[PDB]
Amino acid sequence: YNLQMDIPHAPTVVLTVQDLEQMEATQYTTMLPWLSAPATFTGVKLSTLLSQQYGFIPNRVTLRALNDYAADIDLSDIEKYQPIVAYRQDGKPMRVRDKGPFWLIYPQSSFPKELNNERYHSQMVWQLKQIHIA
Ligand code: NA
Predict the structure, then answer these.
(1) Which domains does the chain have, with CATH numbers?
(2) Distance in angstroms (rounded) separating the CA atoms of residues 64 and 125
(3) Which part of the chain is the Oxidoreductase molybdopterin-binding domain (predicted)?
């Protein structure tokens, strides 16, 4: 249950949950449609993860889940809202058969009108296992 990142002119990198824990941590507290109460997520900013593995922030990346659901994320949204690849919810790891080990989280509660809609909910890929340039 790792995170495969496809790199254009370099080998595909396989990141573990430990690899993300060793990167700069960001925490967001937010409500989301799948939660019973707001939760605090700990993760690495997608911008940080992409720059450290691609050496730049691409125009658009595709995130793919365990079940092959795929969603695209745009540079503008990465810059404006700074979503995180979460690896911890309320300080605990997320079970891999539920939404773990990785879940793309936007800080919905910090930008309610912009983010609380299906346009952004559909980008919050849980059981995240692959990233590639779109
Ligand atoms: Na969508």
Answers:
(1) 3-133 (3.90.420.10)
(2) 7
(3) 1-108
